[PDB]
Amino acid sequence: APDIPLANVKAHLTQLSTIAANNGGNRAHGRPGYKASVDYVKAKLDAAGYTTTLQQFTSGGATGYNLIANWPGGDPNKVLMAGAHLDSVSSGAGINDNGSGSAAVLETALAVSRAGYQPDKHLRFAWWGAEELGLIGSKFYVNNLPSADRSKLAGYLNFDMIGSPNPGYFVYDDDPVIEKTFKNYFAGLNVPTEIETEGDGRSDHAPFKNVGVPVGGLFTGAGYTKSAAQAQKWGGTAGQAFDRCYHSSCDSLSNINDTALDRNSDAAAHAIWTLSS
């Protein structure tokens, strides 16, 4: 797998920050900042050769969208998917929640095209709308997939909050093979990992997990407080939240830890290449 360049991921975060500032200060469902975010991600993918689909749905009286991107080729009967929600809450730009995961998945998709990668499994990437209203966009996607198509899913990898300013390195404990793939990557960097417990079923992997699709993912922490033992293994500040700007107006470009964002972007690419071979 390629090393994902941190500067390219940060450039996507800068564009999402400008989009929020030009649209009222947020990228929330039903507000202009959300569709403008979708348009930016779609344009980058279409230029790189992906087949893109916009899936529209209505929630809370307003139109939302999921953006699905398929890399042509690979086995149609074994699909590996990776995704991230693209909406924010209405209090701010949502740069760590979840510009961080959205930008890492987007740069991984661009890296597949730049590398001229031809995977054995078919690759599909998704950016979900309306996650902050209760996983509405990912539930819409799973509820509308025919059973024949659901059975072709080999795994779904989720990236939601991966650049927290006082980070921890948490790996989901769902499918064992996906979990081992991430743990082995961090082992090679000599960075310890812990099992994800703060978010539980509260992100877009839940609808997939509930229908039997293997899932996994990465998380760097939200409102919970980092312990002394955790600061000893990862640095940072014990007694402070992992993300002091969770769902706040201060979840801006300054609310990102570059080391954690780079490590988790590189781990995302490593898992995508490893599991699609």
Ligand code: MET
């Ligand atoms: C990964 S669980 C914590 C984040 C939560 N899904 C959110 O969007 O706020």
Ligand SMILES: [Ca+2]
């Ligand atoms: Ca990197």
Ligand SMILES: [Zn+2]
């Ligand atoms: Zn989130």
Ligand SMILES: [Zn+2]
């Ligand atoms: Zn959130």
